[PDB]
Amino acid sequence: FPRVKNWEVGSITYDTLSAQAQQDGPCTPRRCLGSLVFPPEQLLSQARDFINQYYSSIKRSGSQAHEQRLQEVEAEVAATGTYQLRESELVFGAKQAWRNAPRCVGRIQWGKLQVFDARDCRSAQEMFTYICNHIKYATNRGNLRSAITVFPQRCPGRGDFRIWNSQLVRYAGYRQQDGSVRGDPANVEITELCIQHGWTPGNGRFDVLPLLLQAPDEPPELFLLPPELVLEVPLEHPTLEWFAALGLRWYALPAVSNMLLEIGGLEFPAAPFSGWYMSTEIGTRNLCDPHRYNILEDVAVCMDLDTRTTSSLWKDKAAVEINVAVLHSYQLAKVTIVDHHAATASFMKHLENEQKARGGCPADWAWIVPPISGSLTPVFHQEMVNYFLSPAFRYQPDPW
Amino acid sequence: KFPRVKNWEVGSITYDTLSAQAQQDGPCTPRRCLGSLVFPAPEQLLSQARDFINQYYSSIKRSGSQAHEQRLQEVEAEVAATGTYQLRESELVFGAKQAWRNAPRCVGRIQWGKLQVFDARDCRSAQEMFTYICNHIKYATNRGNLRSAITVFPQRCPGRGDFRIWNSQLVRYAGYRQQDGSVRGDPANVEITELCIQHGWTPGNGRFDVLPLLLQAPDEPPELFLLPPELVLEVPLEHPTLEWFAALGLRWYALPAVSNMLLEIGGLEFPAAPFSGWYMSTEIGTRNLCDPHRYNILEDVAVCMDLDTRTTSSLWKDKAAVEINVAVLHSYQLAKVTIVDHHAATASFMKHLENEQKARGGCPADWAWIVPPISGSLTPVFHQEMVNYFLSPAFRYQPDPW
Numbered sequence: 001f002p003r004v005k006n007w008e009v010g011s012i013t014y015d016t017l018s019a020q021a022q023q024d025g026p027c028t029p030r031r032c033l034g035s036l037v038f039p040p041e042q043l044l045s046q047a048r049d050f051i052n053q054y055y056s057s058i059k060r061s062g063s064q065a066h067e068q069r070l071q072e073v074e075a076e077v078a079a080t081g082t083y084q085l086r087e088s089e090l091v092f093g094a095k096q097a098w099r100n101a102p103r104c105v106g107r108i109q110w111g112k113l114q115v116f117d118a119r120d121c122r123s124a125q126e127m128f129t130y131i132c133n134h135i136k137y138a139t140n141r142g143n144l145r146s147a148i149t150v151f152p153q154r155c156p157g158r159g160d161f162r163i164w165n166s167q168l169v170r171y172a173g174y175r176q177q178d179g180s181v182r183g184d185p186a187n188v189e190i191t192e193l194c195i196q197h198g199w200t201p202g203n204g205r206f207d208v209l210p211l212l213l214q215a216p217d218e219p220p221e222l223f224l225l226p227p228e229l230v231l232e233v234p235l236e237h238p239t240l241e242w243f244a245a246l247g248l249r250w251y252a253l254p255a256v257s258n259m260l261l262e263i264g265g266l267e268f269p270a271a272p273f274s275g276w277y278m279s280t281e282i283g284t285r286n287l288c289d290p291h292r293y294n295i296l297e298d299v300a301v302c303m304d305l306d307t308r309t310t311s312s313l314w315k316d317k318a319a320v321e322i323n324v325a326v327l328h329s330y331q332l333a334k335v336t337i338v339d340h341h342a343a344t345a346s347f348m349k350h351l352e353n354e355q356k357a358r359g360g361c362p363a364d365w366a367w368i369v370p371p372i373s374g375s376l377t378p379v380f381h382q383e384m385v386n387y388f389l390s391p392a393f394r395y396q397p398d399p400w
Numbered sequence: 401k402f403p404r405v406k407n408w409e410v411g412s413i414t415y416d417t418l419s420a421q422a423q424q425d426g427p428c429t430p431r432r433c434l435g436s437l438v439f440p441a442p443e444q445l446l447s448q449a450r451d452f453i454n455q456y457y458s459s460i461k462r463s464g465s466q467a468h469e470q471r472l473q474e475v476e477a478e479v480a481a482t483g484t485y486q487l488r489e490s491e492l493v494f495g496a497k498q499a500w501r502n503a504p505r506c507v508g509r510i511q512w513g514k515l516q517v518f519d520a521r522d523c524r525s526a527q528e529m530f531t532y533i534c535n536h537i538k539y540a541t542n543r544g545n546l547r548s549a550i551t552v553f554p555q556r557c558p559g560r561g562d563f564r565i566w567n568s569q570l571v572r573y574a575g576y577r578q579q580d581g582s583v584r585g586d587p588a589n590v591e592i593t594e595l596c597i598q599h600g601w602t603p604g605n606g607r608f609d610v611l612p613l614l615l616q617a618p619d620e621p622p623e624l625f626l627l628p629p630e631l632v633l634e635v636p637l638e639h640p641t642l643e644w645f646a647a648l649g650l651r652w653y654a655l656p657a658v659s660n661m662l663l664e665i666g667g668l669e670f671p672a673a674p675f676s677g678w679y680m681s682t683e684i685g686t687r688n689l690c691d692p693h694r695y696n697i698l699e700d701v702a703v704c705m706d707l708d709t710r711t712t713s714s715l716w717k718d719k720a721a722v723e724i725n726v727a728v729l730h731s732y733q734l735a736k737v738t739i740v741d742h743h744a745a746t747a748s749f750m751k752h753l754e755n756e757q758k759a760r761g762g763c764p765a766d767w768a769w770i771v772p773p774i775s776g777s778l779t780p781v782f783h784q785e786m787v788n789y790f791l792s793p794a795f796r797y798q799p800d801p802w
């Protein structure tokens with residue numbers, strides 16, 4: 001039972017939940033790979049275990065309906081080679097996958113999640129409407145609400161529902177006559193696919209990509225997103241009057257549409273989930289990463305900072321002001337956003353809850369500590385244990 | 401079958417083949433990663449020794465030579481006759497540099513080959529130990545033009561106690577527990593402070609009182625020694641534009657000289673081998689001054705800056721922290737004392753990673769310690785995946801001798 005210490009306070013806890021981890025991770029006694037981004041009778045064992053989890057959490061292990069539900073999945077798989085989840089089970093599984101996501105700093109919210117059941121989806125035009133209901137509900141005029149839409153589970157003999165976009169909202173990335181990119185470089189690949197499938201490319205740095213939706217076996221089909229459905233925030237700074245003229249914007253809804261939701265041995269390769277942004281994701285990663293919009297030097301010239309020496313901390317200064325502009329603009333636009341100090345304090349509170357509730361919490365330090373001001377937040381001084389519990393969200397290869 | 405390592409800023413891929421030779425084992429398993437934890441027989445002495453001798457004779461391009469097989473036989477003979485063996489001077493110099501090179505949490509390792517090794521293995525008492533230390537401080541400080549150095553005292557051996565430096569660093573500020581339960585000075589040094597008082601030291605009552613040395617000769621109690629004031633170069637902190645900042649009375653010392661770690665070379669253990677380099681500005685600015693459990697100045701600075709400290713979304717902590725780091729950099733430069741900022745240091749560590757990939761096929765690096773504690777993703781090391789593992793020769797943590 002691993003001993004974990006908090007260095008800010010001195011306290012000690014023990015992670016007894018780690019003793020039950022499953023689909024093993026990347027590390028071995030000889031070497032640690034914690035920093036790397038990307039590291040059939042067996043269906044019945046994953047299904048038994050999940051069902052035991054479910055009746056655990058509703059104060060009802062070892063009695064009528066628990067016994068009975070074990071039998072039906074037995075008979076279902078025995079007759080069909082797969083099984084269907086009761087609707088409450090799907091809800092409970094979706095929330096547990098969020099609760100188990102080790103890289104997620106927003107899990108204090110894990111019990112408030114809206115699950116739209118789309119398991120009876122049947123076409124690409126159907127998805128688009130399921131997606132569009134989600135986007136509408138999650139956005140909610142800027143009062144964001146966490147939501148996931150679960151499309152049909154995978155099964156052999158036939159294909160897969162899949163969203164070729166990494167997120168429901170992404171900005172175009174356009175190559176050049178010199179390699180360089182106008183727009184978002186993280187999305188150059190999926191932009192070529194959209195053009196390659198009919199889309200009429202735009203001219204700008206913030207052109208919202210269309211959606212490439214894939215119904216089983218059939219080739220993808222483009223979908224234009226309704227402009228009023230995609231809520232966006234123009235970026236301005238509370239006191240630097242020229243910042244608005246940089247023409248920067250970001251969207252309101254972080255909606256992740258390429259991950260595979262795995263519940264009880266069932267695999268849903270299309271289960272887009274959405275929450276709300278932590279400010280540093282927008283300000284520091286999307287706008288300042290050298291391989292994203294890379295605006296840091298442009299903001300610093302405008303602030304008349306000494307870009308000639310690194311010891312002036314011109315990067316640090318411009319980065320804070322960008323983050324200020326993000327928090328300021330989203331607030332002025334009445335769009336739910338949370339700062340990395342508030343976020344990390346809530347996560348600390350989540351760890352204390354998870355300690356008493358399950359004897360621990362799987363956390364990936366490198367992704368929990370924010371990308372600016374790390375040691376100024378309390379999670380920096382908190383030792384953490386990382387491991388894989390089920391149900392979970394997993395990464396999957398691109399559909400091509 | 402070797403780990404693939406990507407740099408996300410550039411798209412580069414490399415494989416770390418050196419990890420396969422990881423000579424000891426760490427805290428992680430396929431069940432659970434513990435990478436974020438701060439603190440994770442003649443035949444075996446023979447095998448560690450054999451491996452080190454092989455390393456040494458490789459570095460001088462004499463692997464499998466006459467002299468290489470002679471040294472293997474000499475060591476086996478000495479371990480048989482005495483249970484231990486003695487390093488040649490050149491082996492000690494190589495092993496000390498290798499230990500620095502292998503330190504996974506050190507971002508300064510581009511410098512690993514420019515290391516001044518002082519051999520104090522002939523040391524006989526705590527009083528001689530003090531003289532060696534004073535000379536190390538003098539050579540390394542060099543009037544502010546800092547130089548990396550290590551002094552290595554006699555090895556652990558059967559029949560004798562260890563030489564030990566009780567202080568975690570050669571230069572530290574006292575931490576006085578008081579009541580109301582609070583600490584005046586550096587809270588990290590409360591324990592060693594209480595030990596010094598208990599061993600004869602007359603404490604002060606300042607926030608920046610330099611601690612005496614507690615030095616332990618074999619089979620002896622520890623002895624107190626006052627550092628001569630003129631040997632401890634300090635930097636009063638001021639800010640280039642915020643002029644009230646000098647009225648805080650803040651200071652830091654020039655020389656980071658870690659003194660409580662064990663150096664291991666070829667199976668042999670040096671429980672006393674203090675080493676020193678120069679500071680990266682975030683150690684002083686962010687960690688030593690702003691940690692809530694250290695000097696904890698962030699709120700006071702922010703109130704002074706007239707930042708709105710009633711809400712976190714003003715980012716007052718980030719703004720005050722940036723100005724504290726600017727003040728440290730400016731102050732050390734004004735004082736003509738070597739200091740590197742976290743951007744220059746991480747950029748040179750990337751060059752180190754590239755040198756090391758061409759030379760040994762990899763580099764042990766602990767991402768959570770290599771990424772600076774502010775502005776992480778603004779430095780290039782953030783976007784570099786890394787493989788952590790333990791090579792020998794090595795610096796190791798050891799229990800406090802009390």
Ligand code: HEM
Nearest residue numbers: 098101102103104105106109146273274275276277278393
């Ligand atoms: C409600 C506010 C939320 C916030 C502030 C938030 C924040 C974050 C952040 C900062 C990351 C780091 C990813 C990175 O930077 O690489 C992350 C990852 C992640 N989030 Fe959350 N998120 C929220 C809601 C949700 C919801 C509703 C779900 C799904 C039900 C979710 C599932 C995940 C998963 C699966 C990951 C990746 C985990 C891993 O790969 O181990 N999050 N989130």
Ligand code: HEM
Nearest residue numbers: 500503504505506507508511548675676677678679680795
């Ligand atoms: C020349 C400038 C140097 C710089 C800028 C530097 C920087 C650093 C930093 C920032 C850390 C992490 C400290 C923290 O906890 O925040 C570290 C750790 C460390 N450094 Fe360096 N250092 C330098 C020289 C040296 C030298 C000369 C040695 C030994 C010969 C050394 C050996 C170590 C070791 C052993 C650790 C702990 C690593 C571990 O436990 O794995 N460093 N260094």
Ligand SMILES: CCOc1ccc(-c2ccc3c(C)cc(N)nc3c2)cc1CN
Nearest residue numbers: 037254255256273274275276277278281
């Ligand atoms: C490791 C591959 O990259 C990612 C993986 C997951 C996410 C992620 C996934 C879901 C999120 C949600 C739901 C909200 C939010 N504010 N941030 C989120 C961030 C971001 C990234 C962007 N680095």
Ligand SMILES: CCOc1ccc(-c2ccc3c(C)cc(N)nc3c2)cc1CN
Nearest residue numbers: 438656657658675676677678679680683
């Ligand atoms: C787990 C114990 O923590 C440490 C471990 C090593 C060091 C360390 C050790 C040697 C250093 C040297 C030689 C220079 C420098 N700038 N920083 C150094 C930092 C600091 C610390 C302070 N957290």
Ligand SMILES: C[C@H](O)[C@H](O)[C@H]1CNc2nc(N)[nH]c(=O)c2N1
Nearest residue numbers: 380381382383436437438768769
């Ligand atoms: C708990 C956590 O791992 C611990 O605070 C580590 C994180 N990274 C660090 N990084 C550096 N450079 N120095 C440190 O002391 C630490 N502390």
Ligand SMILES: C[C@H](O)[C@H](O)[C@H]1CNc2nc(N)[nH]c(=O)c2N1
Nearest residue numbers: 035036037366367782783784785
């Ligand atoms: C190379 C490194 O592992 C990689 O950049 C990781 C580290 N930490 C991160 N932290 C956040 N918040 N987001 C990320 O994408 C990453 N990526």
Ligand SMILES: [Cl-]
Nearest residue numbers: 254281282286
């Ligand atoms: Cl994003």
Ligand SMILES: [Cl-]
Nearest residue numbers: 656683684688
């Ligand atoms: Cl220090």
Ligand SMILES: [Gd]
Nearest residue numbers: 301302303304
């Ligand atoms: Gd101007």
Ligand SMILES: [Gd]
Nearest residue numbers: 640641642643
């Ligand atoms: Gd001023």
Ligand SMILES: [Zn+2]
Nearest residue numbers: 027032428433
């Ligand atoms: Zn690990």
